[PDB]
């Protein structure tokens, strides 16, 4: 009742998977056909999952999060497995998820398409947020879609160099995390959605900053320089002091930046791209905004079960994180259909 495994070298690396998975080809991640469900799937083999304390914890983190997500606009775990028969042999973790059509880069729209896509991102963010999970990293490339425009949020669980220069890895991040102004929270995801929604409407990056400071300048041009109250809340005195060096600018008219756009879109953007994260609209409030009248259904916008992440504040040995990851592998129950 443990399935039979077969071995196969791909991108210089040996993949050992259950017979159910066939037609493995690279995309480490491989596309495959799952003969038991009839689904096209992505299969990720984690590299050196238990090499260090930090990597062991990250592997546990990733497996906990994926095991938890059971929502249509969020990417779920279809299977998790290992070729090992015991903890002592355990050293490889394979994660199986749906293969999606295309990310949101490839796809860049009508106002109907923008409503439907942003609706879906918010529906999934409500679910994620209600479990006190923060995505941190929402961008077009973490948002996959199919032929029918049905959307899933991807990639849960970034160096100084990756975040430097003219790079998409920073264009969608909220200013408070981009510059470490304060202990940030869930609201940073809403900032990202604002950036994405703007991009879907204009076909152009909202804040294509050439570095952190240029981006901040582009941001402050649009939404205004911070006010007295927001300044108080910037915990970092070095950053607060830098902000105060800038000459004050008022919030621009959004109707004149997003010309031709549905006024309800303009309105929603204004509530999303508010500099003060305490005054940003929530995923749950956004869903009730008139812009989504076509799609809004308060009975089909579910929330998540509670998610214990007390493990985040725990300092454990490698073997202990590996043991905890083992338990979660062998306890995995697949979804029903
Ligand atoms: F996001 C995760 C997390 C854990 C494992 C895996 Cl394989 C993934 C990526 N999954 C996935 N990506 C896509 C996709 C399709 C097109 C662009 O992205 N479909 N499915």
Query: Which residue do the tokens 């338990």 mark?
Result: 327
Task: For residues 108 and 201, give the distance between their C-alpha atoms in angstroms, rounded to a whole number.
Answer: 10
Q: What is the DSSP letter of 175?
A: H
Considering only the C-alpha atoms of the chain, give the largest distance between any 2 of them, rounded to a whole number of Å.
69
Say if CB 321 and CB 82 are below 8 A apart.
Answer: no
DSSP per residue over 248-302, as a string? P-PPPPSTTTSTT--HHHHHHHHHHS-SSGGGSPPHHHHHTSGGGTTT--TTS--
Cα dihedral 11/31/74/148 (nearest 10): 140
Nearest one of 68, 67, 72, 145 to 302, comparing CA atoms:
72
Same fold, 2-101+304-333 and 102-303: no
Query: Which residue do the tokens 């430097």 mark?
Result: 164
Tokens (6 digits) for 331: 């306890």
- Is 95 touching ligand 1 by the criterion CB < 6 Å? yes
Tell me, in Å, the resolution of the deposited structure.
2.6
Closest C-alpha to ligand 1, atom 15:
100
Nearest one of 187, 130, 156, 132 to 76, comparing CA atoms:
156
Q: Which parts are annotated binding residues? A: 27-29, 44
Could you tell me the end-to-end alpha-carbon distance of the chain, in angstroms, rounded to an integer? 20
Closest C-alpha to ligand 1, atom 3:
155
Each domain of the chain, given as residue ranges in start order, spans 2-101+304-333, 102-303
> Which of ligand 1's atoms lies nearest the C-alpha of 102?
16
Task: For residues 215 and 213, give the distance between their C-alpha atoms in angstroms, rounded to a whole number.
Answer: 5
User: What technique solved it?
Assistant: X-ray
Say if CB 74 and CB 124 are below 8 A apart.
Answer: yes
Task: For residues 140 and 172, give the distance between their C-alpha atoms in angstroms, rounded to a whole number.
Answer: 9
Say if CB 216 and CB 178 are below 8 A apart.
Answer: yes
Q: After which residues is the chain broken (C to N over 2.5 A)?
A: 27, 108, 157
Q: Residue 128: what are its φ and ψ, rounded to 5°?
A: -55, -50
Q: Which contiguous run of DSSP H or E holds residue 89? A: none
Task: For residues 44 and 29, give the distance between their C-alpha atoms in angstroms, rounded to a whole number.
Answer: 4
**Which residues, in sequence order, are bridge partners of residue 153?**
74, 143
Sheet with strand 102-103: strands edge to edge: 102-103, 143-145, 151-153
- Third-level CATH fold of 2-101+304-333: Phosphorylase Kinase; domain 1 (3.30.200)
What superfamily does domain 102-303 belong to in CATH?
Transferase(Phosphotransferase) domain 1 (1.10.510.10)
Tell me the three state secondary structure of residue 40. Answer: strand
Query: Which residue do the tokens 């991040």 mark?
Result: 173
Active-site choice (103, 111, 155, 276) = 155
Closest C-alpha to ligand 1, atom 20:
99
Say if CB 27 and CB 80 are below 8 A apart.
Answer: no
Tokens (6 digits) for 111: 């106002």
Say if CB 94 and CB 45 are below 8 A apart.
Answer: yes
**CA atoms 262, 266, 267, 271: torsion sign:** positive
């Amino acid at each position: 009742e443990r399935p039979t495994f077969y071995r196969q070298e791909l991108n210089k690396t040996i993949w050992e998977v259950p017979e159910r998975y066939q037609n493995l080809s690279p995309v480490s991640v491989c596309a495959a056909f799952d003969t038991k469900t009839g689904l096209r799937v992505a299969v990720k083999k984690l590299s050196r999952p238990f090499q260090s304390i930090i990597h062991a914890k990250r592997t546990y983190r990733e497996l906990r999060l994926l095991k938890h997500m059971k929502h249509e606009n969020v990417i779920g775990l279809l299977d998790v497995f290992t070729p090992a028969r015991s903890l002592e042999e355990f050293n490889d973790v394979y994660l199986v998820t749906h293969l999606m059509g295309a990310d949101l880069n490839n796809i860049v729209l009508t106002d109907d398409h923008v409503q439907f896509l942003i609706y879906q991102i918010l529906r999934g963010l409500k679910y994620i947020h209600s479990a006190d999970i923060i995505h941190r990293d929402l961008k077009p490339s973490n948002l996959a879609v199919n032929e029918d425009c049905e959307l899933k949020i991807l990639d849960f669980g970034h160096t100084d160099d990756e975040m430097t220069g003219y790079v998409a890895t920073r264009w969608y991040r909220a200013p408070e995390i981009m510059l470490n102004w304060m202990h940030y929270n869930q609201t940073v995801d809403i900032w990202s959605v604002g950036c994405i929604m703007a991009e879907l409407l204009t076909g152009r990056t909202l804040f294509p900053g050439t570095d952190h400071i240029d981006q901040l300048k582009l941001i402050l041009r649009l939404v205004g320089t911070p006010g007295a109250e927001l300044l108080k809340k910037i915990s970092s005195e070095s950053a607060r002091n830098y902000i105060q060096s800038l000459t004050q600018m008022p919030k621009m008219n959004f109707a004149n930046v997003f010309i031709g756009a549905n006024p309800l879109a303009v309105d929603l953007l204004e509530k999303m791209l508010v500099l003060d994260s305490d005054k940003r609209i929530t995923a749950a409030q956004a869903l009730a905004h008139a812009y989504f009248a076509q799609y809004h259904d308060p009975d089909d916008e579910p929330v998540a079960d509670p998610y214990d992440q007390s493990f985040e504040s725990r300092d454990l040995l490698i073997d202990e994180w590996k043991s905890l990851t083992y338990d979660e592998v062998i306890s995995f129950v697949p979804p029903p259909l």
